[PDB]
Symmetry: D2
């Protein structure tokens, strides 16, 4: 579902924000 | 390659758009 | 890992492409 | 934006994410 995919993308966005260059 | 912060901000904005799609 | 997150994102991108406007 | 366009953008972002570091 769109909502399930959006939830997953939001979680991944926060994880990506904790990476480094 | 963009920064982690810029990529995360982009992903967040896309996630909000995805949520408005339909099955 | 960046690779694992990127692979997850690619899978999600493909699923998004199969959604409807 | 269309599902196709959003998917293209997400794919582009995934390629970039793969070049980041832990």
């Amino acid at each position: 579902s769109p909502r399930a995919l959006a939830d997953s993308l939001m979680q991944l966005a926060y994880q990506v924000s904790r990476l480094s260059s």
